[PDB]
């Protein structure tokens, strides 16, 4: 997250870290046995880490559970990143408590102008590199459809939305993929892609979760 602040230990209880020997993507806990992340984050042998703040230090509230299976969306396109969503089933159910909790699925799509919360352990610099040890947070509004398409001509589909600032300076970044965009207590987005990080007129692009609610509900209940 570039231009953000520090969330505070366990204040974003649904945030998880996908680990393959190292943190590479984020995710969102939707129920005791399921996590939603981005399809481009797929890897075999993923270990999900819940209740984390400082990813380097063991603080006592962590839960490390292996992924039992990963379902990539049937129409995911790795070239265009269309339908960039994936479901990960945990090998064992996570113990829910004050530090580990699920986030609600939306009933309707969010409108332009709505303030959302984006979080992750990704790069904190637009130029260069700096990876945080503690979870970072960013408050950003959903941008209008027109703004998004003009920023990325011919690259925005109906399953994507832009969130951020056209002035640049604040945005999600590498290492934030698969993480949550929560608006009004509901999971509206998934960190997906962008052109650089926090660049002028180049806001982040997120997977529009409201278009996948029935698919998610069906999958979770059938596996």
């Amino acid at each position: 997250i570039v231009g953000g602040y520090t969330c505070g230990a366990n204040t974003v209880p649904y945030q998880v870290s996908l680990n393959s020997g190292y943190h590479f993507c984020g995710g969102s806990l939707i129920n005791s046995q399921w996590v939603v992340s981005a399809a481009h984050c797929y890897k075999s042998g993923i270990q999900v880490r819940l209740g984390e703040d400082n990813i380097n230090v063991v603080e006592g509230n962590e839960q490390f559970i292996s992924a039992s299976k990963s379902i990539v969306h049937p129409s995911y396109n790795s070239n265009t990143l269309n339908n960039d969503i994936m479901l990960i089933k945990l090998k064992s159910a996570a113990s829910l408590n004050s530090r580990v909790a699920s986030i609600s699925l939306p009933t309707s799509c969010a409108s332009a102008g709505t303030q959302c919360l984006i979080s992750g352990w990704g790069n904190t610099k637009s130029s260069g590199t700096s990876y945080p040890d503690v979870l970072k947070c960013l408050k950003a509004p959903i941008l209008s459809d027109s703004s998004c398409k003009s920023a990325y001509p011919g690259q925005i589909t109906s399953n994507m939305f832009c969130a951020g600032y056209l002035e640049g300076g604040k945005d999600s970044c590498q290492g934030d993929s698969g993480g949550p965009v929560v608006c009004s207590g509901k999971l509206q987005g998934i960190v997906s892609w962008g052109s650089g990080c926090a660049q002028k007129n180049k806001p982040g692009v997120y997977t529009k979760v409201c278009n996948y609610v029935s698919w998610i509900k069906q999958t979770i209940a059938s596996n």
Binding site: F24, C25, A38, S78, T80, L81, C173, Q174, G175, G196
Partner: peptide
């Protein structure tokens, strides 16, 4: 360009995903 926000190490541009490039050892 289209560059996924996944953390990934690299030795050359070709190691990265989609239109991401290897900027000093990290895809971006």
């Amino acid at each position: 360009r289209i560059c996924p926000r996944i953390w990934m190490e690299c030795k050359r541009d070709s190691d990265c995903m989609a239109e991401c490039i290897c900027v000093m050892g990290h895809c971006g």
